[PDB]
Amino acid sequence: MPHAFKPGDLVFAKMKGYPHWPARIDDIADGAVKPPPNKYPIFFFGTHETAFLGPKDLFPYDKSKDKYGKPNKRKGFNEGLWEIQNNPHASYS
Ligand SMILES: CCC(=O)NCc1nnc2n1CCCC2
């Protein structure tokens, strides 16, 4: 059965106006800004941006990749597909 989300989990993450996007749950570094309650820090592959999202917008990657993991015209998306498949746990700073 499923656990709660934890840092390192791979997802497609949904935000208003964008396609379901390759992303990971991030850790919060010591001394860095924490997310609001009930929100997770989501690192978006390709764009390398971070937003705070709750589980309603987080789709586990294994289950969802058949539907959401196809090339898209949006800036950063196809780079993001490469990252989530080939080196999802790397430093992208
Ligand atoms: C998250 C930061 C933001 O609002 N910038 C717009 C934006 N541009 N590409 C993306 N995003 C959002 C999430 C999918 C990747």
φ, ψ for residue 37, nearest 5 deg: -50, 145
* Alpha carbon distance 71, 21 (integer Å): 11
Resolution in A: 1.6
Q: Tokens for 14?
A: 């949904």
Q: Which DSSP letter does residue 44 get?
A: E
φ, ψ for residue 44, nearest 5 deg: -90, 120
* Alpha carbon distance 60, 9 (integer Å): 8
| Spatial strand order in the sheet of 50-53 | 50-53, 40-44, 21-25, 10-13, 58-60
- Best residue among 11, 18, 84 to mutate for probing ligand 1's pocket (most ligand atoms within 8 Å of CB) is 18
Instruction: Indicate if ligand 1 lies below 6 Å from the C-beta of 43.
Output: no
CATH for 1-12+22-28+38-79, options being 2.30.30.140, 1.10.10.10, 3.40.1190.10, 2.40.40.20: 2.30.30.140
Instruction: Indicate if ligand 1 lies below 6 Å from the C-beta of 35.
Output: no
Residue 5 CA to chain centroid, in angstroms?
12
List Cβ neighbours of 1 (8 Å cut-off, separation of 6 or more).
none
* Alpha carbon distance 32, 65 (integer Å): 31
- Best residue among 47, 52, 84 to mutate for probing ligand 1's pocket (most ligand atoms within 8 Å of CB) is 47
Q: Tokens for 83?
A: 């990252």
